[PDB]
Amino acid sequence: DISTAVVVTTISDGGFLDRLAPALRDAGARLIVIPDRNTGPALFAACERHRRLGLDVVCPSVAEQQDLLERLAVPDLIPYHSDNRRNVGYLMAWMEGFDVIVSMDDDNLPTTDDFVERHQVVCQGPRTQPVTASSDGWFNNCALLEVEPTEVFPRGFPFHARPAHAQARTSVCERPADVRINAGLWLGDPDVDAITRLAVRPNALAHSGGSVVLAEGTWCPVNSQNTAVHRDALPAYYFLRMGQPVDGVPMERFGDIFSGYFVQVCAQHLGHAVRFGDPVVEHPRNEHDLLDDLHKEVPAVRLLDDILDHLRDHPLEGGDYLETYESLSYALQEIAERVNGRAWSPDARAFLHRSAHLMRSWTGALRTVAGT
Template structure:
């Protein structure tokens, strides 16, 4: 592994005690802590004690554990002319994590590891695995007859069959299609590395309610292997236990949720659409997304599933619209920012004829927000 600077970024309304296990894992695997930082992006509900806790971890381990409180965020954005970004990213939402991504990139991180506060470290070499992001490496490149791969199929479950367990965001219209995957040994440039999870998999609410799946292990054929997407295949990717190279920063925009569309509040597709857009651009630019280790324990925080089902319902419909457009459009550009702006424009041309006025209005607002993010990245990074 080349010597990279790696930033672990989370947002939470609790003390990020899970960082301690990540730090201990780095030490146990003989990595020098001076290459790492740990960033907690606060929100309106985050207790003030979190700052003291992070400072205490910094002193205990002689490393950088930063807390970025609400006022810190405001001051930082004002000092860099990012007032539009501050207005755009809602409080009391995971989208404040975007600010942590951008700060880490500005500070010189090569790789950003995005964590939820319920992603618990396992025994894998976390830094060693995530540190390969941005490198060409040996992978099992997957292709699928319908161009959709289900990374949830890499796990064993307590249930007798995992056939109908799909990663959250996998389009329903593609679930009954032929999924005879082919795997080929290849060398590919891995720009996003998505770790897998034991215990509670990242699935949609319908699956949680119907099946209550629990992942017990990685299937034997995928142990210590990476499965990477070929240049025509999509697969959901999220922002928990996931690392991306900071060259992709213009693409790593967790889309704000909570808007009302056709009388329903939308949620749970913020990172899913981020992933789909990034994969479309990587297909143009030659990189790939890979799935495998490190494997974390997803000790999922308590959720109101009935409420989440209401929020996910309209997203399932919109997901089909976005997937259809994504598969149909052709994008171009010689850099990631160029490709991202071209994708925004190609989507704008398509959504004018999609669905109801409410749906079109939401998609237009989403694309406008993506431009706000692209402008912020341009100011900070270029």
């Protein structure tokens, strides 16, 4: 019997619970809600109300969060006033021993009653199955949706790849694959970068293309808004800390762009696969300072293409996700000094070195829980 924990970090009143609780109550999943400093006492009351409405929801105060993190010798790992606190749920799910961790934004909702069931596709084992390859090494998961004005790419999709991608070949082949990451897609406002939402304000109308499993060597960004990770891969899913300056501008909003590529690079080196498609969620068009999104995303966007390129020519070592993830952190340190370009000021290069330390601090903590 497959156990599942859904992880959500929020500073809201808690109102999403009222419409989120159905899919998770019926499937008997656990919801881990990770509050921050600024989370009013509304949520906790919504937490306990929904609990004896049947739902297995837990909601640890910042105080409980910091007790746990001190015991794991990681008091400074996870900052406050940040959706990085997601990581606290990840850890808790992994300690309690769930099979499936689903990362959810406090912002979208299941559109089907089989939501939890379809995310269990990451516990079906290795089997031969249709596998999707792309001659350019990239796959565009938004091609699986009907958007509205024009075609779009996902947030985190590399920019150097987009012009030639229309001329790439897509294959499908029955081959051994082992799905460990299921990235479910989004109706309404699709997960595009700020550059794209300013330009075309896309609207995702339907899920039309079914689902796919990417061949080794075919990559695609994976966010943490509607994503199932098998407990084994959880170690490589550390949500990257934002705030590092690129040429003086502090990076924000790409912590899951890095997590999604890091777990994917890691999964593939271990013979595992990323899946895209169902279960789909609806993400309401809740617009805000789109210009401020852009200023926050441009620093990370200026780096990501060079980082991806160098990751393709860096072999990793390791037999499990922890060992592979630490290998990756060391590769990022070498990439940091090898890479060239106008955006690679000394603070940008140092960004890779600090995240690398932070990934190893994260794996250190996993090692302590698993040592006792």
